[PDB]
């Protein structure tokens, strides 16, 4: 009951480009009463040297069913990276002071992606 997340991945291998389209989420769970329903999505490539491994969607306002409809792009992504790394996608609510509450996540092993073949996801978030 944490919510479901919709997204699409495409590895444009010849251009060393991993395109992560964060589409929508449905039924995000209300948590902290002092929090806001201001959801956003964070991407992390693991393992990663921090900083550069992170991308982030826009933050929406007052919604438990956000539609970001946004593509985040990792450039300089090689086959060594696709074989070694995991993409962690986490959904958080931004609070009144710019901090946040973690709702849930999903992970995907990049070696399961075939070059140039888009893969569409509709998964339920989990806590780990
Ligand atoms: O530099 P950016 O573009 O802001 O990207 C931030 C980065 O991905 C952090 O890992 C994340 O921290 P948390 O996972 O702890 O939230 C932060 O969330 P934030 O919006 O709360 O700072 C993101 O905004």
In three-state secondary structure terms, 53 is: helix
Place of tokens 């919604």: 63
What is the per-residue DSSP string for 41-110? EEEEEES--SGGGEEEPPPP-S-SS-EEEEEEEEES--HHHHHH-EEEEEEEEE-TTS-EEEEEEEEEEG
With a Cβ cut-off of 6 Å, ligand 1 is lined by: 42, 54, 56, 92, 94, 99-100
φ/ψ of residue 52, rounded to 5: -65, -15
- Please tell me the experimental approach by which this structure was elucidated: X-ray
**Could you tell me the domains of the chain?**
1-128 (2.60.40.150)
Closest residue CA from atom 8 of ligand 1? 54
What CA–CA distance (Å, rounded) separates 115 from 113? Answer: 6
Percent of the chain as helix, strand, coil, to the nearest 5: 10, 50, 40
Among 42, 96, 101, 128, residue to substitute to test ligand 1 (most atoms within 8 Å of Cβ): 42
φ/ψ of residue 79, rounded to 5: -65, -30
């Amino acid at each position: 009951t944490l919510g479901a997340l919709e997204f699409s991945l495409l590895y444009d291998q010849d251009n060393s480009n991993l395109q992560c389209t964060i589409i929508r989420a449905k039924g995000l769970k209300p948590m902290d009463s002092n929090g806001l329903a201001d959801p956003y999505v964070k991407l992390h490539l693991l393992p990663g040297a921090s900083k550069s491994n992170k991308l982030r969607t826009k933050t929406l306002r007052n919604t438990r069913n956000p539609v970001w409809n946004e593509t985040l792009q990792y450039h300089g992504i090689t086959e060594e990276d696709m074989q070694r790394k995991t993409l962690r996608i986490s959904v958080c609510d931004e609070d009144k002071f710019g901090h946040n509450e973690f709702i849930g996540e999903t992970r995907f092993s990049l070696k399961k992606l075939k070059a140039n073949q888009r893969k569409n996801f509709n998964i339920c978030l989990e806590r780990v």
